[PDB]
Amino acid sequence: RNRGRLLCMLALTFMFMVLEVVVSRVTSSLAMLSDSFHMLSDVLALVVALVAERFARRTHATQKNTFGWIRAEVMGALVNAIFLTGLCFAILLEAIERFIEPHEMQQPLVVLGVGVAGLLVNVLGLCLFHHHAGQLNMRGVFLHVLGDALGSVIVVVNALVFYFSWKGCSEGDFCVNPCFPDPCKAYEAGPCWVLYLDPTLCVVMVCILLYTTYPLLKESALILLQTVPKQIDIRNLIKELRNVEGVEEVHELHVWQLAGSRIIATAHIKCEDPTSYMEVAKTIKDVFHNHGIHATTIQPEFASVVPCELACRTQCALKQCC
Amino acid sequence: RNRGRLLCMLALTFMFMVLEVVVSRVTSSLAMLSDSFHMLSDVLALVVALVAERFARRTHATQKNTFGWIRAEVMGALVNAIFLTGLCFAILLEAIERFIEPHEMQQPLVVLGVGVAGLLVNVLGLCLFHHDRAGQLNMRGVFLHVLGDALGSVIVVVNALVFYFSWKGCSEGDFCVNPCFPDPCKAYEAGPCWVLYLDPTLCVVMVCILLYTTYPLLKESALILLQTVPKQIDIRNLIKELRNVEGVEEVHELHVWQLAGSRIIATAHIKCEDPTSYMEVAKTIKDVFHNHGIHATTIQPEFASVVPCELACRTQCALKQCC
Numbered sequence A: 001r002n003r004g005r006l007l008c009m010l011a012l013t014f015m016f017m018v019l020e021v022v023v024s025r026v027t028s029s030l031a032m033l034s035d036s037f038h039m040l041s042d043v044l045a046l047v048v049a050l051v052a053e054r055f056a057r058r059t060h061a062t063q064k065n066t067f068g069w070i071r072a073e074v075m076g077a078l079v080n081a082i083f084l085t086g087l088c089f090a091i092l093l094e095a096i097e098r099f100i101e102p103h104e105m106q107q108p109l110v111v112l113g114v115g116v117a118g119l120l121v122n123v124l125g126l127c128l129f130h131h132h133a134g135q136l137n138m139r140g141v142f143l144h145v146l147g148d149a150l151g152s153v154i155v156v157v158n159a160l161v162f163y164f165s166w167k168g169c170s171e172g173d174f175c176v177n178p179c180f181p182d183p184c185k186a187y188e189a190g191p192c193w194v195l196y197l198d199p200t201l202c203v204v205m206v207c208i209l210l211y212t213t214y215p216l217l218k219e220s221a222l223i224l225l226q227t228v229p230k231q232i233d234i235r236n237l238i239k240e241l242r243n244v245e246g247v248e249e250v251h252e253l254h255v256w257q258l259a260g261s262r263i264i265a266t267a268h269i270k271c272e273d274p275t276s277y278m279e280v281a282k283t284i285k286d287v288f289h290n291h292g293i294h295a296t297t298i299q300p301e302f303a304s305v306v307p308c309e310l311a312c313r314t315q316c317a318l319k320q321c322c
Numbered sequence B: 001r002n003r004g005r006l007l008c009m010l011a012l013t014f015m016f017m018v019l020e021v022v023v024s025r026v027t028s029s030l031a032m033l034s035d036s037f038h039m040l041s042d043v044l045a046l047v048v049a050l051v052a053e054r055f056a057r058r059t060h061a062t063q064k065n066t067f068g069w070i071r072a073e074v075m076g077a078l079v080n081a082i083f084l085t086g087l088c089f090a091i092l093l094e095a096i097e098r099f100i101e102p103h104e105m106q107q108p109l110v111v112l113g114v115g116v117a118g119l120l121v122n123v124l125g126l127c128l129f130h131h132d133r134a135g136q137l138n139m140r141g142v143f144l145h146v147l148g149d150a151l152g153s154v155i156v157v158v159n160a161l162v163f164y165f166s167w168k169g170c171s172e173g174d175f176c177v178n179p180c181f182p183d184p185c186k187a188y189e190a191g192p193c194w195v196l197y198l199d200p201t202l203c204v205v206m207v208c209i210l211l212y213t214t215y216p217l218l219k220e221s222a223l224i225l226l227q228t229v230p231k232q233i234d235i236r237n238l239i240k241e242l243r244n245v246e247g248v249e250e251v252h253e254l255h256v257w258q259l260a261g262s263r264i265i266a267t268a269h270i271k272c273e274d275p276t277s278y279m280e281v282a283k284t285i286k287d288v289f290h291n292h293g294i295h296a297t298t299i300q301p302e303f304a305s306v307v308p309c310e311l312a313c314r315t316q317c318a319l320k321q322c323c
């Protein structure tokens, strides 16, 4: 039911975006107009997750992809992780700008209400996405929703502090502080500890998001690159492969995984005599069993002049595998 | 080489960042310093390309990567393409924001000069980057990333020139204020309003062109990392030619995929009739694979029906076998 949760969250994002646009139009606040389009990024993340899930629904050999689209979910997870990292850097740059150029919010009450609505939406999204292969895509979506929830917590706390520990002027009163620039060059009621509360909270949220996102990005990149899974030791596999009767040379051992538990192995063997190859093949498959290998393709090279006899004419092109 | 070009572009980017920082310090135009900080996007793109180029040369097998890190270049190209797409979406969002509300530029002269310097730097970068496919994929990604900011600098220069030549300023307190832009504190612009919306429309056209030119690279990188059979290899024809040899009666699981550039790996299961004189047909299947772009193969003969493959696990789990 992965598609159901994604569709529900996407529908909620649309409803909350429409609510924010309506609130902005009725209150004629341009900041809410600006913030309404900021969830196009979340909508894009949900669309990418949905596309990856839909394309991973099919796993069949095709004239375009022999393996099928099994690697669609890991690609979607990688795309979501990169998008989240880019968003984190963008909001970090925005936080630096806020440090350099502080802003003063308008109507803290409506901002607090919007933040509370967003916080409820985000916490129920976490309730849907806490996971009550395909988990990596769900993990990336959950990380994105958690980043949105942290942003909502930040805006709620910022609005609460600005409403409880700040005092501005509603008219031309004498409270101008030269810390913030004034238009055309224009007291102690409103301290400066609040204007800088939003940027520091944003920086902390950026650090938390990067901390919790780095493992997902690392795993997605390691899957997309042809890396042996961390649960498989190459040295032990080689040791058990050479300790097999009838086989003495094992070259071209390439081990990698497509997605999830679909680990694929490939090796060449010098299997002594041709007639008794079949008995050795079952032992080789069993040996792959003790490890985590299952997809296999073993080449029984028969006959020290050359390591691999079935090699091509010229490999100087480096067009091979390793 | 290629690493030297990346180091040179990184040095130029850092020099331009220093130039914009000092210009902002001596001018107090904080938008210039904001753009200097934005150049961290180019810094990050060049750093990613540098890391990919450094790690791609480790072609030898490793205890953690049996294939080696020769997939690093294509992964770096994919990362740069996704970063460029995200930057393009951010630019389009900013253009929509400018439609929502415009801004008045403080001083067209210094921003025009900074834009000219950026245009020259980006033109030098384009000259560097215009001239294995995997090595070229990273080069093309960096070239597109440079061209995006080159177009951005061109937009800045054009807007500055038009704003200076064809707009009327309003600084001193007078009747020159117009509600076209919001008036702080509740407050006749003889300059045409056509200029207030020159950054956004040009940025929209630029992002359209950038997305159009970055779609092919992103698609190619995604296809390579999705184990898509290369477009120059036909699976059906290769199956038909493999089944034409005398010693093979049936082939299953012709897993063909592209590793990087011109490295295609094909693993196939064939059913040979007899172990005697088997090497006669192994040479033929290797040759017929060579007849195409596949040079690194691995074939498993199966000597023996109802079952499709006589070698399989005890459970034949559909979630643990390939395809």
Ligand SMILES: CCCCCCCCCCC(CCCCCCCCCC)(CO[C@@H]1O[C@H](CO)[C@@H](O[C@H]2O[C@H](CO)[C@@H](O)[C@H](O)[C@H]2O)[C@H](O)[C@H]1O)CO[C@@H]1O[C@H](CO)[C@@H](O[C@H]2O[C@H](CO)[C@@H](O)[C@H](O)[C@H]2O)[C@H](O)[C@H]1O
Pocket (backbone or CB within 6 Å): A048, A051, A052, A055, A063, A064, A072, A075, A076, A079, B218, B219, B222, B223
């Ligand atoms: C973020 C997640 C990324 C991973 C997930 C996506 C990975 C890519 C998906 C592969 C992909 C794009 C590749 C290029 C863009 C890659 C962008 C990557 C960007 C990464 C950031 C291959 O592209 C297609 O491949 C087909 C097979 O080679 C072939 O066309 C073939 O279909 C033509 C149909 O019109 C047809 O006319 C032509 O005759 C065919 O031969 C063409 O090559 C091409 O159309 C698209 O998927 C393909 O298209 C359909 C999709 O739903 C899907 O069609 C089915 O349902 C349709 C319902 O309406 C309807 O048509 C049919 O019921 C059925 O056909 C295909 O089954 C699927 O395979």
Ligand SMILES: CCCCCCCCCCC(CCCCCCCCCC)(CO[C@@H]1O[C@H](CO)[C@@H](O[C@H]2O[C@H](CO)[C@@H](O)[C@H](O)[C@H]2O)[C@H](O)[C@H]1O)CO[C@@H]1O[C@H](CO)[C@@H](O[C@H]2O[C@H](CO)[C@@H](O)[C@H](O)[C@H]2O)[C@H](O)[C@H]1O
Pocket (backbone or CB within 6 Å): A217, A218, A221, A222, B048, B051, B052, B055, B064, B069, B072, B075, B076, B079
């Ligand atoms: C945009 C595309 C980017 C693609 C990048 C592809 C390349 C990735 C390179 C990183 C990576 C692959 C894993 C992926 C990480 C995340 C990657 C990014 C993911 C998101 C995209 C391999 O790379 C490591 O990097 C080393 C430093 O450069 C280098 O070693 C250099 O050493 C000399 C000194 O420098 C130099 O003289 C020599 O010449 C180099 O050999 C080797 O290449 C390698 O060891 C890291 O893997 C492992 O990470 C471990 C710590 O987690 C850590 O392991 C260690 O454990 C013990 C100590 O705890 C120690 O006892 C082990 O011995 C050791 O193993 C190592 O780091 C590495 O084993």
Ligand SMILES: CC(C)CCC[C@@H](C)[C@H]1CC[C@H]2[C@@H]3CC=C4C[C@@H](OC(=O)CCC(=O)O)CC[C@]4(C)[C@H]3CC[C@]12C
Pocket (backbone or CB within 6 Å): A082, A085, A086, B044, B045, B048, B051, B079, B080, B083
């Ligand atoms: C949003 C896009 C455009 C960028 C995504 C972030 C990258 C800039 C990051 C993500 C993962 C990072 C890599 C993670 C791990 C390593 C291994 C690291 O190697 C070590 O130093 C190992 C330890 C040692 O040798 O002491 C070198 C940096 C590198 C390649 C990092 C380089 C920067 C990377 C690619």
Ligand SMILES: CC(C)CCC[C@@H](C)[C@H]1CC[C@H]2[C@@H]3CC=C4C[C@@H](OC(=O)CCC(=O)O)CC[C@]4(C)[C@H]3CC[C@]12C
Pocket (backbone or CB within 6 Å): A206, A207, A208, A210, A211, A212, A214
């Ligand atoms: C240096 C610039 C480019 C910023 C990079 C991101 C930062 C926000 C830092 C702050 C805290 C860092 C994290 C703190 C510690 C770790 C250790 C490690 O993950 C763990 O926590 C494993 C256990 C351990 O801490 O050793 C991998 C990197 C990570 C997540 C770090 C990744 C980079 C983070 C998120």
Ligand SMILES: CC(C)CCC[C@@H](C)[C@H]1CC[C@H]2[C@@H]3CC=C4C[C@@H](OC(=O)CCC(=O)O)CC[C@]4(C)[C@H]3CC[C@]12C
Pocket (backbone or CB within 6 Å): A085, A210, A213, A214
């Ligand atoms: C999400 C994006 C912004 C990337 C953030 C992290 C990166 C800036 C990379 C670049 C270099 C990386 C570091 C390179 C070397 C190491 C040593 C490495 O040491 C170990 O393996 C100790 C055991 C352990 O991992 O617990 C731990 C990861 C760490 C800190 C890496 C953490 C991730 C780093 C900081």
Ligand SMILES: CC(C)CCC[C@@H](C)[C@H]1CC[C@H]2[C@@H]3CC=C4C[C@@H](OC(=O)CCC(=O)O)CC[C@]4(C)[C@H]3CC[C@]12C
Pocket (backbone or CB within 6 Å): A044, A045, A048, A051, A079, A080, A083, B082, B085, B086
């Ligand atoms: C988070 C962002 C930055 C990632 C990059 C942008 C993606 C949202 C885009 C880039 C390429 C797009 C894909 C390009 C091509 C297609 C094929 C398309 O299917 C067809 O056109 C096939 C024929 C048919 O219509 O049936 C379905 C959408 C899809 C997967 C697109 C989904 C959205 C993608 C992944």
Ligand SMILES: CC(C)CCC[C@@H](C)[C@H]1CC[C@H]2[C@@H]3CC=C4C[C@@H](OC(=O)CCC(=O)O)CC[C@]4(C)[C@H]3CC[C@]12C
Pocket (backbone or CB within 6 Å): B092, B207, B208, B211, B212, B215, B216
């Ligand atoms: C959705 C909003 C936020 C941005 C919209 C930007 C558009 C102006 C861009 C985005 C992607 C672009 C498309 C990306 C890919 C192609 C394919 C390109 O060639 C083809 O039709 C097939 C190419 C092939 O098969 O290699 C023609 C332009 C087109 C439709 C582009 C037209 C312009 C598009 C729609």
Ligand SMILES: [Zn+2]
Pocket (backbone or CB within 6 Å): A251, A252, A268, A269, A299, A301, A307, A308, A309, A310
């Ligand atoms: Zn061999």
Ligand SMILES: [Zn+2]
Pocket (backbone or CB within 6 Å): A252, A254, A320, A321, A322
């Ligand atoms: Zn090899």
Ligand SMILES: [Zn+2]
Pocket (backbone or CB within 6 Å): B252, B253, B269, B270, B300, B302, B309, B310, B311
């Ligand atoms: Zn078979």
Ligand SMILES: [Zn+2]
Pocket (backbone or CB within 6 Å): A312, A313, A314, B290, B294, B295
């Ligand atoms: Zn060859």
Ligand SMILES: [Zn+2]
Pocket (backbone or CB within 6 Å): A288, A289, A293, A294, B313, B314
């Ligand atoms: Zn098994």
Ligand SMILES: [Zn+2]
Pocket (backbone or CB within 6 Å): B253, B255, B321, B322, B323
């Ligand atoms: Zn298969």
